[PDB]
Amino acid sequence: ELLKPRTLADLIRILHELFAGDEVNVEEVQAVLEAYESNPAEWALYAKFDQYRYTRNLVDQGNGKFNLMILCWGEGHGSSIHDHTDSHCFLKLLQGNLKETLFDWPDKKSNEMIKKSERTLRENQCAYINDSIGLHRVENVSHTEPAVSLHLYSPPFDTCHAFDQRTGHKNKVTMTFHSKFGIRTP
Give the angle subtended at the CA of 67 by the CAs of 142 and 81, to the nearest 5°: 45
The residues near 108 (Cβ < 8 Å, ≥ 6 apart) are none
Among candidate residues 139, 137, 138, 146, the one with its CA nearest the CA of residue 165: 137
**In angstroms, what is the C-alpha Rg of the chain?**
16
- Whether the CB-CB separation of 9 and 41 falls below 8 Å is answered with no
| Burial of 52: CB neighbours in 10 Å, binned 0-12, 13-18, 19+ | exposed
End-to-end, the C-alpha distance of the chain in Å comes to 41
Determine whether the annotation assigns residue 82 to a binding site. yes
Strand partners, 161: 172
Determine whether the annotation assigns residue 84 to a binding site. yes
- Whether the CB-CB separation of 145 and 75 falls below 8 Å is answered with yes
**Three-class SS state of 88:** strand
Annotated binding site: 82, 84, 136
Annotated binding site for Fe cation: 82, 84, 136
